[PDB]
Amino acid sequence: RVNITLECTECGDRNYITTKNKRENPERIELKKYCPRLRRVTLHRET
Amino acid sequence: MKTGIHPEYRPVVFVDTSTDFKFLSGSTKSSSETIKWEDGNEYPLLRVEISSDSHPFYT
Amino acid sequence: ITKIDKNKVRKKRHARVRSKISGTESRPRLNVFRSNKNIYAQIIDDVNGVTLASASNLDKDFGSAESKVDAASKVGELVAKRASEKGITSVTFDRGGYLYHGRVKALAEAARENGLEF
Amino acid sequence: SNGRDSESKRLGAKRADGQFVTGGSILYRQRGTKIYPGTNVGRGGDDTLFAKTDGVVRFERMGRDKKKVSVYP
Amino acid sequence: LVPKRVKYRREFRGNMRGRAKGGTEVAFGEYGLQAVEASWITNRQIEAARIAMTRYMKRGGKVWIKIFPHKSYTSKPIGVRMGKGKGAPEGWVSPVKRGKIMFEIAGVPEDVAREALRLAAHKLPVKTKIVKR
Amino acid sequence: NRLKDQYLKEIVPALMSKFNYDSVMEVPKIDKIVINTGVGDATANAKVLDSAVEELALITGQKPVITKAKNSIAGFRLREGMPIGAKVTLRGERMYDFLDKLVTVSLPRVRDFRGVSKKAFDGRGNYTLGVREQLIFPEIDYDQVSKVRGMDVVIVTTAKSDEESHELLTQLGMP
RNA sequence: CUGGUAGUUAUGGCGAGAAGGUCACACCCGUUCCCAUACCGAACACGGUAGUUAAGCUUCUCUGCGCCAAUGGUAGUUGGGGGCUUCCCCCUGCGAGAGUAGGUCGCUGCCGGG
RNA sequence: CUGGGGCGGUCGCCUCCUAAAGAGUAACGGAGGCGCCCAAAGGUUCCCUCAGAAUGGAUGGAAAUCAUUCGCAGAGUGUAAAGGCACAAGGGAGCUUGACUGCGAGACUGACAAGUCGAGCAGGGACGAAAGUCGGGCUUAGUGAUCCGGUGGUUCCGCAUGG
RNA sequence: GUCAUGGAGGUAGAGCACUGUUUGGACUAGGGGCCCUUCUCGGGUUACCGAAUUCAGAUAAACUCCGAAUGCCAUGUACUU
Ligand SMILES: [K+]
Ligand SMILES: [Mg+2]
Ligand SMILES: [Mg+2]
Ligand SMILES: [Mg+2]
Ligand SMILES: [Mg+2]
Ligand SMILES: [Mg+2]
Ligand SMILES: [Mg+2]
Ligand SMILES: [Mg+2]
Ligand SMILES: [Mg+2]
Ligand SMILES: [Mg+2]
C-alpha cells in the first residue's frame, strides 16, 4: 500500500493524491475527477 | 424461468419393457424414438427397467 | 411450512420509504395502496395527519379500464386533477413499499403528466 | 505494564434544554446515538448533534427507550 | 473455596457499609449463624468453621455455606518499598456485612445445632448471633 | 400434469373426507421439492463440483445453485465462502414431473426398499428422502460419470401433522 | 361496518379461545406481455376471479406471559449535629430499587367506499 | 520520571475502570489496543436479516451443505474497548468515484501550537422515476512541527536594460 | 443567593434482565467406575464425574431490567444581593 498521485490527462497538473494497494491494484488507477483548471470532470490517471 | 441457462425440459414418454406400461413425464435426454400412444402429439421414448407396477415390493 | 404475509412484509418496506419521505403543508406525500383487484391514491400531510385529495379505481367518476395499468393511469390523471382543484402543486411520491415499476409507476407517470411537480 | 490512558474527549451536552442557540451550535458530543437528531438538528460524521437553525433546544423522549434533541424557533 | 476463574486478577478492597442486601433470613436450614458486625471472612476461616461444625454433627444433618470468597486480595513482600504496581494475589475473602447469615444447618436437634454453631463462631473473626427459622 | 391432475381429481376429497377439514384450503398440498448434493470434498478440488452440478442439473431439468459454506471449520478443513454442495428448488408442474419420476421410474432401481420410513418425518409435516447413489435416476448414465456423490431430496408439505403428510405422500404413490 | 393512512413510553405486545366474508381485503388461478429468480412466476411483476374463509385481516372474549402502577415502609442521601469508629447513631429536607393493592386484551385522528 | 539514586520499567496516540450520575481529575493504580487497512470494506438505489438449538436426511463424523420450527439479537459491525446499530450502522445485488474544487454562518475543545463538528453558498458531477443522499469508511487510534533539500505547476519578482 | 420550571448525566442504593463469579435441590443428555456375548455398540448397575434445564438462593471497580440525594446546564414577567 502506497501513496499515489493522479495526473489530469488534459489539464496536465496533478492535484489529487490517493492511496492504493499495489499488489491488488498493480495497474495505474484511472478515476474521473473534477479538474479545477478546466472546471469540469476529466479522466485522471496514476503517474 | 430464465432462458439459455437450464437444459431442455422437453416432454418424453417412459415405457417399462416387461409390463409394457406408458406414461408422459417431461425430462432431459431425448434419445429420439417415436411413440405409439398419442402419436399426434409426438414425443420421444425411453426404454426403462421395471417400474412401480412391475417391481415386486409394490405389487 | 408458513405462507409469508405479503402486506406485513410490504408494510416493512413502506416504513423504510417513510423514513426519508413525509408530507408537509407546503409539499404533501402522494401515498399509493395496491390490491389484487384495484389501486388507491391519497395526498397526505403527516405534520397535520390529514388526507387532502384522494382517488380510487372504484369512484363513480372514471369507471372504464382495459388493463390494471390503464386503470391505474386513470387514477393518477384524476388525483392530479382533484389536487390541482384543491390548489396543491409539488408532492413527493410514496411508493407505499411497492417496486416503482408496473401499476404504481403508471399512477406516478400519469399524475406527473398532469399538474403535479415531482 | 499498565500506565496508559487516552486524552478525555469532553463528550456530553453542550447546550441546556430551554436555551436559545444559533445555527451550527453543537448540542451534544457523543459516540454513536445516545441521543438522536430531532427537528432542525443534524448528526455530524462523529455523531455530534448540531442545530441547523437558530431557536430553543428541547431534549425529548422518542419512544420508551430512545431520546432526541430538537431546536424550535 | 476459590473461584474457578476471575475476569480480573486484582480488585479494589471495597467497603462494608450497611446491612447485607441479601441472605439475612435463614433459607435452606433450621438454624443459622448470623454476622452481627461486618468483616472480611477468608476462605481459610470458612474451611476451619465448616470442619468444626460438620465434625460435631458427626456427618449428620446438612450444612449450607451461604458466603463465598469471590474477592481476591494482594500483598507486597517484606523489604519492598511502595509503588512499582499492585502486589500479587495472596488470598480470597467474602466481605460479610452485618445481618448476613454465613452458615445454615438442619437435620440435627436444637442442642447439637446450637453447639456446632458456637464451635464454628470461635473460628470466625466476626461477632455472631445464632438465629433459627 | 399426470400427477397434479390426479391430486385435483381423486386425492383432495378422498383426503378431506379422511380428516374432515372445514375448507378445501386446509387440504395438504406439496409446496416445493428441494434436492441438495453436499459436495464437501470440493474443498480439495473444484472440478469435482462442476461434475456434481452438471449431473444434478440433468436429474431436475433445472440448473442448480452452488451453496457456499457459512462458518469456518478446521475439522473438515473449511473456511468462509468456498463452494460446498448444490441446491435446486422444484415448484409447480416441473416438480410433480420429478415426484412422479421419483415414485414411478427412479426408486425401483435401488437394490431394495422398506417404504415411507416412518422415522424420516421432521415432526412438522415434511419428508426427507435419503438417496444413497445417483445411478438410481435414469437421466444419469453411470458409464458417463466418475464418482457417485449421492443426493438428499426434501419434500415440503402444507400438512400440519406427519399423519396428514404420510397420507398425502402415500396417495401420491410414494411407497 | 370495512379498506387505506397517521399519532400515541406494549395499559397498545405475546399467547389462548370464538365468530365473520362477493362490498372491500386476502389467500387463490395463470405466465402471453412489461418485469423477475446468483436455481425456482416461492418471492417480485403482469393478467385473471373457478374455488375458500383454512390462514392473514376484522370484530369479540380472557390476565397465562409480558407491560403499566399507587399508598405505606425501608435503603441511600443534601444540610446540621454526636460517637466507642473495618464503621455507627440523632435532627431536618429529599427519597428509591424490590415487593404489593391495583390497571391493561388500547386510546385518539383524517380519507375512501357501505 | 523514580516513595533516595542505580538496576529494571516507562516516554506519543486510542478505549475502559479508578472518576465521587455534567465536564475535568493523580499514582512506577487496574485492564487492553495503535504507528494500519479497504478500488470496496467508499457513494447511491433497490432488496434483505443474524447466533444457536431441536427434528428429519447419501457421502458425512459433536460440527460442512439441504429442509421445517423456535429464536430482540444470545450474531455481525476490517481492527482494542466503550458508546451505538435489526426504519439497521449488520447482509446481498445494479450503476458508480462526493475517498469532489472553491469555501463556510456558527459552535466544541483549548495556555499556545494544534485538534473537532458544521448547516448553507458556488462550480461541476454519481446514484435515484422522484424526494433526496454523497466533501470516504457505525463512531472515537493509524501519527511528527519548523529549518533545509527534491519534484511538478505558476496571468509573481528578476539588483542598469533584455534575458 | 434562593424560589419555581425544564433538561443532560448512570454514582449511592438496589437488582439479577445481560456478562462474569457462586450455593443447594430436582431433572437429564453424555463420560467414568462394574460384569455380560461385546467392537463396553446397547443394557442391568450407579450420588465416581458431568453439559444443559429449571426451582430456590447469593455476588460485582472495569454487570445493569432499574435508579436517588446532591452537584451541573439553562429559563423567569419571581424575591434578595
Ligand atoms: K468470633
Ligand atoms: Mg486521564
Ligand atoms: Mg469520517
Ligand atoms: Mg521512601
Ligand atoms: Mg527508590
Ligand atoms: Mg463524570
Ligand atoms: Mg528552495
Ligand atoms: Mg536585470
Ligand atoms: Mg453498590
Ligand atoms: Mg455498579
Side-chain angles (χ1 to χ4, degrees):
Chain A
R1 181 160 285 281
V2 299
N3 294 339
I4 288 306
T5 167
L6 306 192
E7 195 173 6
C8 178
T9 57
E10 305 177 8
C11 335
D13 60 3
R14 43 251 221 161
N15 295 357
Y16 284 114
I17 62 168
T18 63
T19 175
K20 77 174 186 173
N21 197 307
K22 69 178 178 60
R23 281 70 74 177
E24 271 62 9
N25 293 252
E27 78 295 346
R28 303 217 307 222
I29 280 57
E30 296 179 2
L31 299 171
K32 296 168 63 57
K33 309 290 289 173
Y34 182 76
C35 190
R37 189 190 300 244
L38 305 180
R39 307 258 306 306
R40 67 166 177 288
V41 177
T42 295
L43 182 64
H44 292 60
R45 179 179 297 108
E46 165 182 347
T47 57
Chain B
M1 182 66 79
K2 294 180 178 178
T3 184
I5 300 295
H6 329 71
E8 75 293 351
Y9 293 60
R10 59 100 58 66
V12 56
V13 180
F14 290 65
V15 300
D16 178 43
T17 191
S18 59
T19 192
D20 197 0
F21 268 55
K22 315 192 175 60
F23 72 97
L24 184 68
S25 182
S27 176
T28 57
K29 191 177 66 59
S30 57
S31 309
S32 303
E33 290 294 304
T34 189
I35 61 170
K36 186 172 66 62
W37 168 76
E38 198 73 5
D39 58 353
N41 305 359
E42 190 62 54
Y43 313 123
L45 183 75
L46 293 177
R47 199 65 49 66
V48 193
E49 191 263 9
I50 62 175
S51 174
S52 291
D53 50 3
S54 181
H55 188 283
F57 164 72
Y58 288 66
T59 307
Chain C
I1 187 174
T2 55
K3 268 65 178 181
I4 64 171
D5 179 3
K6 289 189 188 66
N7 196 59
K8 253 40 160 173
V9 302
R10 198 270 296 176
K11 215 70 199 70
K12 200 77 177 299
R13 289 203 295 285
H14 189 204
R16 173 164 58 235
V17 170
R18 287 292 325 294
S19 186
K20 317 247 275 188
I21 295 181
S22 67
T24 323
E25 293 180 2
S26 308
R27 173 160 204 167
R29 169 171 66 112
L30 174 62
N31 170 60
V32 169
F33 174 60
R34 190 196 64 192
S35 305
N36 296 348
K37 200 78 71 59
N38 31 56
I39 195 169
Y40 314 71
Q42 300 191 21
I43 296 180
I44 317 176
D45 300 9
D46 296 90
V47 64
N48 290 342
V50 302
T51 291
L52 288 61
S54 60
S56 311
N57 195 191
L58 51 100
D59 296 354
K60 279 68 66 174
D61 195 1
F62 289 132
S64 58
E66 299 74 4
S67 182
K68 302 187 193 172
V69 301
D70 293 0
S73 295
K74 299 290 291 300
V75 189
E77 190 175 0
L78 175 68
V79 60
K81 185 183 176 182
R82 283 180 183 178
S84 185
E85 294 291 352
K86 189 70 65 176
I88 192 52
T89 306
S90 180
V91 302
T92 50
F93 195 56
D94 168 7
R95 291 189 296 134
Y98 303 109
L99 198 85
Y100 185 86
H101 173 246
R103 296 199 272 161
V104 304
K105 180 173 181 297
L107 194 159
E109 257 46 57
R112 181 140 54 190
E113 192 71 5
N114 293 243
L116 272 194
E117 296 177 0
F118 64 101
Chain D
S1 277
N2 308 310
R4 295 178 301 292
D5 203 3
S6 62
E7 194 48 62
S8 301
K9 291 300 185 291
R10 283 88 180 159
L11 300 186
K14 300 301 186 189
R15 289 289 182 284
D17 174 294
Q19 195 173 14
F20 179 83
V21 293
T22 59
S25 290
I26 294 177
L27 299 188
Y28 207 73
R29 292 275 195 179
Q30 65 182 347
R31 299 281 81 96
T33 59
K34 288 181 85 286
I35 306 189
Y36 279 82
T39 161
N40 293 319
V41 174
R43 176 187 163 193
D46 66 345
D47 314 309
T48 301
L49 306 181
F50 60 90
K52 284 155 70 77
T53 62
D54 287 50
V56 178
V57 177
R58 295 297 181 193
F59 283 95
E60 302 165 297
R61 209 182 59 254
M62 255 197 327
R64 196 161 195 97
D65 52 1
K66 285 174 166 47
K67 192 177 294 205
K68 65 181 182 170
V69 67
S70 305
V71 157
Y72 297 114
Chain E
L1 286 189
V2 178
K4 284 178 286 292
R5 53 170 300 293
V6 292
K7 194 167 42 183
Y8 293 99
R9 286 184 55 237
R10 306 189 168 74
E11 178 173 352
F12 289 166
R13 281 109 171 143
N15 67 88
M16 278 175 310
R17 292 186 286 261
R19 283 190 64 74
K21 53 157 62 189
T24 57
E25 296 295 352
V26 48
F28 307 124
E30 306 169 5
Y31 300 96
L33 193 53
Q34 163 166 78
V36 169
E37 65 192 6
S39 165
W40 276 9
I41 308 297
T42 67
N43 61 350
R44 297 307 85 221
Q45 297 162 3
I46 292 172
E47 185 58 4
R50 190 194 66 74
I51 298 175
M53 248 153 81
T54 197
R55 190 185 302 123
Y56 186 72
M57 291 168 104
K58 292 187 286 286
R59 298 179 59 248
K62 273 199 72 170
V63 168
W64 295 263
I65 309 174
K66 294 289 296 306
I67 63 179
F68 188 90
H70 288 295
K71 168 166 286 166
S72 62
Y73 68 91
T74 66
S75 53
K76 313 287 272 303
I78 289 174
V80 165
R81 298 198 175 154
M82 299 290 95
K84 259 57 102 184
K86 189 159 175 62
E90 194 184 6
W92 300 96
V93 294
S94 178
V96 176
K97 299 190 177 174
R98 56 197 173 71
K100 167 72 78 163
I101 296 195
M102 287 176 293
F103 298 90
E104 286 174 9
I105 56 181
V108 297
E110 189 160 4
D111 60 296
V112 173
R114 286 187 172 287
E115 181 54 15
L117 289 188
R118 74 159 273 268
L119 288 192
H122 280 289
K123 310 298 187 182
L124 298 190
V126 73
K127 276 187 186 297
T128 69
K129 191 200 306 303
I130 298 174
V131 50
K132 73 178 296 181
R133 192 199 286 246
Chain F
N1 54 357
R2 173 192 170 289
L3 218 190
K4 193 172 73 67
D5 191 5
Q6 173 186 350
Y7 172 64
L8 274 76
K9 287 292 175 61
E10 57 101 12
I11 310 195
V12 159
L15 193 54
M16 170 158 88
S17 302
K18 183 175 294 183
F19 292 119
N20 189 6
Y21 293 123
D22 303 4
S23 290
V24 293
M25 296 300 316
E26 281 185 339
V27 174
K29 43 178 295 184
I30 308 188
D31 252 9
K32 57 172 185 295
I33 309 168
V34 184
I35 301 93
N36 183 225
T37 333
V39 183
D41 180 62
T43 185
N45 185 51
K47 186 171 68 67
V48 171
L49 210 197
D50 189 8
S51 60
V53 160
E54 188 66 9
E55 68 191 15
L56 191 78
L58 291 169
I59 289 173
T60 66
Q62 178 174 303
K63 86 156 283 183
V65 62
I66 298 172
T67 71
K68 300 156 79 292
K70 185 185 296 183
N71 293 352
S72 178
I73 311 179
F76 304 129
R77 191 157 52 68
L78 193 77
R79 183 164 52 251
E80 280 84 10
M82 256 193 320
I84 162 174
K87 180 202 295 181
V88 74
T89 61
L90 280 75
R91 300 172 182 286
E93 293 183 1
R94 225 310 181 249
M95 176 189 80
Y96 281 119
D97 286 1
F98 180 74
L99 213 208
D100 190 53
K101 291 208 298 293
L102 212 203
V103 164
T104 305
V105 171
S106 182
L107 275 174
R109 289 171 55 70
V110 183
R111 51 261 191 177
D112 55 355
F113 197 20
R114 190 257 64 105
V116 171
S117 178
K118 291 293 190 301
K119 186 169 59 58
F121 287 117
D122 57 355
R124 236 114 274 279
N126 316 295
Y127 188 74
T128 57
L129 172 56
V131 172
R132 292 288 101 122
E133 296 172 359
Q134 54 179 230
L135 66 99
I136 78 169
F137 221 85
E139 278 91 54
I140 202 70
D141 292 355
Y142 186 60
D143 60 300
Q144 301 294 301
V145 184
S146 58
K147 190 179 184 301
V148 300
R149 287 319 311 165
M151 166 172 308
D152 190 12
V153 165
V154 197
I155 317 177
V156 179
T157 72
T158 306
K160 302 298 180 183
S161 175
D162 295 1
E163 292 290 354
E164 297 180 3
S165 179
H166 184 49
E167 291 296 351
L168 183 70
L169 284 185
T170 300
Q171 292 189 185
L172 281 170
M174 185 167 219

XYZ file of all heavy atoms in Angstrom, chain C residues 46-81:
251
model
N -48.413 14.724 6.897
C -48.022 13.948 8.104
C -47.905 14.900 9.300
O -48.094 14.431 10.440
C -46.741 13.140 7.866
C -46.873 12.057 6.805
O -46.616 12.359 5.619
O -47.196 10.909 7.179
N -47.609 16.178 9.051
C -47.499 17.227 10.109
C -48.868 17.391 10.784
O -48.917 17.353 12.035
C -46.951 18.555 9.542
C -47.876 19.182 8.504
C -46.627 19.551 10.649
N -49.937 17.535 9.988
C -51.344 17.645 10.460
C -51.923 16.245 10.684
O -52.778 16.096 11.580
C -52.222 18.408 9.464
C -51.899 19.889 9.393
O -51.263 20.452 10.303
N -52.359 20.538 8.327
N -51.479 15.266 9.893
C -52.020 13.894 9.882
C -53.393 13.857 9.235
O -54.317 13.281 9.845
N -53.522 14.455 8.045
C -54.821 14.643 7.333
C -54.623 14.385 5.836
O -53.677 14.946 5.253
C -55.406 16.047 7.588
C -55.613 16.305 9.074
C -54.557 17.149 6.966
N -55.494 13.559 5.253
C -55.580 13.295 3.793
C -56.302 14.469 3.126
O -57.465 14.734 3.494
C -56.305 11.971 3.512
O -55.462 10.903 3.953
C -56.661 11.780 2.050
N -55.630 15.138 2.186
C -56.226 16.187 1.316
C -56.958 15.465 0.177
O -57.880 14.672 0.488
C -55.111 17.117 0.821
C -54.521 18.057 1.873
C -53.890 17.288 3.026
C -53.494 18.991 1.245
N -56.570 15.710 -1.081
C -57.038 14.952 -2.268
C -56.876 13.443 -2.043
O -55.965 13.044 -1.289
C -56.273 15.400 -3.492
N -57.742 12.644 -2.675
C -57.673 11.160 -2.724
C -58.428 10.647 -3.955
O -59.319 11.379 -4.444
C -58.239 10.563 -1.466
O -59.594 10.948 -1.293
N -58.086 9.441 -4.438
C -58.725 8.817 -5.619
C -58.479 7.308 -5.658
O -57.343 6.878 -5.388
C -58.207 9.452 -6.870
N -59.517 6.557 -6.039
C -59.538 5.075 -6.106
C -59.842 4.634 -7.540
O -60.013 5.513 -8.409
C -60.547 4.516 -5.139
O -60.385 5.089 -3.846
N -59.884 3.315 -7.754
C -60.240 2.660 -9.039
C -61.750 2.393 -9.058
O -62.249 1.889 -10.088
C -59.454 1.358 -9.212
C -59.474 0.800 -10.619
O -59.062 -0.339 -10.838
N -59.953 1.580 -11.576
N -62.455 2.732 -7.969
C -63.893 2.414 -7.763
C -64.639 3.646 -7.227
O -65.593 3.468 -6.442
C -64.006 1.197 -6.835
C -63.216 1.258 -5.523
C -64.112 1.651 -4.353
C -62.531 -0.074 -5.247
N -64.242 4.847 -7.666
C -65.051 6.090 -7.555
C -66.072 6.098 -8.701
O -65.818 5.420 -9.718
C -64.161 7.338 -7.586
C -63.205 7.451 -6.410
O -63.306 6.619 -5.485
O -62.362 8.371 -6.427
N -67.179 6.832 -8.537
C -68.281 6.926 -9.536
C -67.756 7.583 -10.821
O -68.275 7.246 -11.912
C -69.477 7.704 -8.972
C -70.417 6.904 -8.074
C -69.824 6.476 -6.745
C -69.524 7.637 -5.821
N -69.074 7.169 -4.488
N -66.771 8.483 -10.689
C -66.080 9.158 -11.820
C -64.946 8.245 -12.306
O -64.206 7.718 -11.446
C -65.585 10.546 -11.397
C -65.194 11.460 -12.554
O -65.318 11.030 -13.729
O -64.767 12.605 -12.268
N -64.822 8.074 -13.632
C -63.854 7.175 -14.319
C -63.993 5.744 -13.782
O -63.299 5.390 -12.801
C -62.412 7.682 -14.171
C -62.084 8.929 -14.959
C -61.419 9.997 -14.360
C -62.410 9.027 -16.307
C -61.110 11.140 -15.084
C -62.100 10.172 -17.029
C -61.450 11.226 -16.416
N -64.866 4.954 -14.420
C -65.090 3.527 -14.116
C -65.054 2.680 -15.378
O -65.942 1.802 -15.525
N -64.064 2.932 -16.256
C -63.877 2.247 -17.563
C -62.380 2.080 -17.857
O -61.718 3.100 -18.163
C -64.571 3.005 -18.666
O -64.079 4.337 -18.753
N -61.875 0.841 -17.768
C -60.453 0.481 -17.992
C -60.361 -0.816 -18.812
O -61.366 -1.565 -18.870
C -59.742 0.338 -16.664
N -59.169 -1.049 -19.402
C -58.855 -2.223 -20.262
C -57.940 -3.177 -19.488
O -58.248 -4.386 -19.434
C -58.179 -1.774 -21.560
C -59.036 -0.856 -22.420
C -59.193 0.573 -21.923
O -58.559 0.926 -20.906
O -59.954 1.334 -22.556
N -56.855 -2.636 -18.923
C -55.852 -3.347 -18.088
C -55.695 -2.610 -16.752
O -56.067 -1.414 -16.687
C -54.537 -3.450 -18.820
O -53.584 -4.171 -18.056
N -55.161 -3.294 -15.731
C -54.968 -2.720 -14.370
C -54.000 -1.531 -14.445
O -54.164 -0.597 -13.636
C -54.424 -3.757 -13.384
C -55.248 -5.024 -13.188
C -54.690 -5.884 -12.072
C -55.266 -7.281 -12.022
N -54.553 -8.126 -11.033
N -53.025 -1.570 -15.365
C -52.053 -0.456 -15.591
C -52.822 0.756 -16.128
O -52.611 1.857 -15.599
C -50.895 -0.846 -16.533
C -50.098 -2.022 -15.991
C -51.364 -1.142 -17.954
N -53.685 0.555 -17.128
C -54.503 1.636 -17.739
C -55.423 2.202 -16.657
O -55.550 3.438 -16.576
C -55.299 1.138 -18.949
C -54.440 0.751 -20.142
O -53.200 0.870 -20.042
O -55.019 0.334 -21.167
N -56.024 1.319 -15.856
C -56.897 1.673 -14.715
C -56.136 2.618 -13.782
O -56.710 3.643 -13.375
C -57.337 0.425 -13.991
N -54.879 2.279 -13.489
C -54.011 2.985 -12.519
C -53.560 4.336 -13.095
O -53.320 5.260 -12.294
C -52.851 2.094 -12.152
N -53.470 4.451 -14.425
C -53.156 5.715 -15.143
C -54.327 6.690 -14.988
O -54.073 7.904 -14.830
C -52.844 5.474 -16.598
O -51.655 4.711 -16.748
N -55.559 6.172 -15.038
C -56.801 6.970 -14.867
C -56.810 7.573 -13.458
O -57.318 8.701 -13.304
C -58.044 6.104 -15.102
C -58.164 5.480 -16.487
C -58.453 6.470 -17.600
C -59.838 7.080 -17.523
N -60.904 6.051 -17.595
N -56.262 6.850 -12.475
C -56.261 7.266 -11.041
C -55.291 8.439 -10.888
O -55.695 9.467 -10.306
C -55.883 6.116 -10.088
C -56.104 6.516 -8.632
C -56.642 4.835 -10.411
N -54.059 8.273 -11.379
C -53.059 9.353 -11.461
C -53.669 10.595 -12.084
O -53.544 11.683 -11.490
N -54.310 10.424 -13.245
C -54.928 11.514 -14.044
C -55.935 12.248 -13.157
O -55.992 13.491 -13.221
C -55.584 10.936 -15.300
C -56.040 11.996 -16.298
C -56.576 11.442 -17.609
O -56.595 10.198 -17.771
O -56.973 12.258 -18.471
N -56.677 11.491 -12.346
C -57.806 12.006 -11.531
C -57.277 12.642 -10.239
O -57.819 13.693 -9.846
C -58.784 10.855 -11.268
C -59.946 11.182 -10.328
C -60.892 12.187 -10.972
C -60.689 9.912 -9.931
N -56.267 12.042 -9.601
C -55.739 12.525 -8.287
C -54.954 13.812 -8.546
O -55.060 14.741 -7.732
C -54.895 11.468 -7.540
C -53.673 11.017 -8.329
C -54.490 11.948 -6.150
N -54.199 13.858 -9.643
C -53.534 15.077 -10.152
C -54.577 16.190 -10.290
O -54.360 17.288 -9.741
C -52.885 14.784 -11.480
N -55.663 15.893 -11.009
C -56.771 16.834 -11.320
C -57.390 17.324 -10.006
O -57.428 18.550 -9.799
C -57.795 16.137 -12.222
C -58.938 17.008 -12.726
C -59.942 16.238 -13.556
C -61.129 17.076 -13.984
N -62.113 16.278 -14.756
